[PDB]
Amino acid sequence: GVSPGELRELTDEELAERLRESKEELFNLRFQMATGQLNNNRRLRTVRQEIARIYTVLRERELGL
RNA sequence: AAGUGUCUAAGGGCGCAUGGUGGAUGCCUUGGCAUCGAGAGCCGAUGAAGGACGUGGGAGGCUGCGAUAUGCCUCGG
Ligand SMILES: [Mg+2]
Ligand SMILES: [Mg+2]
Ligand SMILES: [Mg+2]
Numbered sequence: 001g002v003s004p005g006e007l008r009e010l011t012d013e014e015l016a017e018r019l020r021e022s023k024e025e026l027f028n029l030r031f032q033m034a035t036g037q038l039n040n041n042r043r044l045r046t047v048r049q050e051i052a053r054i055y056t057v058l059r060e061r062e063l064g065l
Numbered sequence: 066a067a068g069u070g071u072c073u074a075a076g077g078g079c080g081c082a083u084g085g086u087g088g089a090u091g092c093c094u095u096g097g098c099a100u101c102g103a104g105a106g107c108c109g110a111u112g113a114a115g116g117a118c119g120u121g122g123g124a125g126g127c128u129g130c131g132a133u134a135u136g137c138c139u140c141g142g
Contacts, residue, residue: 033122041122045136052133053082060138 001050005056019054022047 002018010018026047032038 038122044122048133049137051138054137055133056137059133 001046002053007053012061013056015054015058015063019051019058022051023054026051041052 006010007015007018026044029044029047032042033044
């Protein structure tokens with residue numbers, strides 16, 4: 001998973017693009033799991049956690065980091 | 066001829082032998098009861114107490130959490 005330390009250099013738009021990419025990846029993983037071709041089921045939790053990480057970074061950046 | 070004379074058990078009773086059922090007794094316990102010594106004595110429109118509905122790779126309950134959903138960040142151990 002992407003680390004907060006290496007996340008904290010993207011300014012705002014790179015963070016937003018990363019969040020969009022992560023949401024798309026999570027969507028794809030959900031579909032693959034639904035149709036039964038996903039083997040490593042830990043990927044869903046990993047992607048959910050990195051989405052939460054990006055959201056946390058954005059929010060704390062807004063609220064006087 | 067006259068006379069004397071057993072036994073059996075369809076079922077039943079008593080006593081043993083050997084089983085069944087049942088869960089008393091004995092011995093226990095992540096459960097209670099009664100106090101003692103320290104704290105803290107309020108929470109809420111910055112939305113409470115308490116909930117409904119969801120959330121995990123696999124159905125449900127409990128427990129945690131809230132679409133960032135058995136979790137996110139920071140500092141300590
Ligand atoms: Mg008899
Ligand atoms: Mg008989
Ligand atoms: Mg640590």
